[PDB]
Amino acid sequence: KRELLRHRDYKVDLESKLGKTIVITKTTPQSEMGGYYCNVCDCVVKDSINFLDHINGKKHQRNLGMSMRVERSTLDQVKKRFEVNKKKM
Amino acid sequence: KDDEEADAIYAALDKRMDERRKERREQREKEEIEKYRMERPKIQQQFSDLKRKL
């Protein structure tokens, strides 16, 4: 029941907390620690590039009930995408 | 299984390529250690008579 891979419709706020300072204590769990965190995979990553690698990893997709396989597109939907993109602008 | 067959085939081929002078050089080696062995006997041989008396 591993669904095929799909593009991320949402951008990732890699630079959201630039310049900010986060105070972390012993009691503070991984949720609010500094860096990047994913609840889907429940992990903390202190890089933008490593976070992108993680969200592009096998385990992260697997925890989403997904698979690394990308579906082969069809001609009709490609043409319709061209048409709708032309109509939008 | 077939990996073993391929390895055996290549090993037999390498052994066959060695038959050009294998027996000649091996008999030369046999006749060459014995030439050296008379002048320089084996260490255990030099103690054979003493060992027998034990």
Binding site: - | D2, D3, A6, Y10
Partner: protein, 189 residues
């Protein structure tokens, strides 16, 4: 019980596919592939010793190749008649000297000829179709070079003439005095 020759397209297809080891279809059996790779220097030695001579455009050579395309050997020893070979190379000497005297600017090749990330060319779609360029060949006078003119500048000349060679093995040669004199005159340089 002798092994019949395979069509040249069989080895062409075998080399064309299985090119990258990343394919997992043929990874099941690799001992047969790996065990035949240690003889790469032998393939190198047989290939370079059968290099075509400047008087020859295309040289078809017998080829012994692994069943998986792991390695290809040129199963041929370059036997050449010594007077014929010397005369051919003397005529080559004459031709290259005349070309260097005649050609105003000689464009030396660029080494390496191709880019380092450029993959080796496919023979079928790049060389098999294009006609070869003219080779170096001294012009032979039909009057005085007649004893050698017909079979000169040929790969293994007189190989099929049972009068002048023992046979296809190309081991012995029996040449007439006019041919020997013509070859001797062609190799004075």
């Amino acid at each position: 019980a002798q092994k019949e020759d395979m069509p040249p397209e069989h080895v062409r297809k075998i080399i064309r596919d299985h090119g990258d080891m990343t394919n997992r279809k043929f990874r099941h059996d690799k001992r047969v592939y790996l065990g035949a790779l240690k003889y790469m220097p032998h393939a190198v030695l047989k290939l370079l010793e059968n290099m075509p001579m400047p008087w020859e455009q295309i040289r078809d050579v017998p080829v012994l190749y692994h069943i998986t395309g792991a390695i290809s050997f040129v199963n041929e020893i370059p036997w050449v008649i010594e007077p014929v070979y010397i005369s051919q190379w003397g005529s080559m000497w004459i031709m290259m000297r005349r070309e260097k005297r005649d050609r105003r600017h000689f464009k030396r090749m660029r080494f390496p000829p191709f880019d380092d990330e450029e993959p080796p060319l496919d023979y079928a779609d790049n060389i098999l179709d294009v006609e070869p360029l003219e080779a170096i060949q001294l012009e032979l006078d039909p009057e005085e070079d007649a004893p050698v003119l017909d079979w000169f500048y040929d790969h293994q000349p007189l190989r099929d003439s049972r009068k002048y060679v023992n046979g296809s093995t190309y081991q012995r040669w029996q040449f007439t005095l006019p041919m020997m004199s013509t070859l001797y005159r062609l190799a004075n340089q």
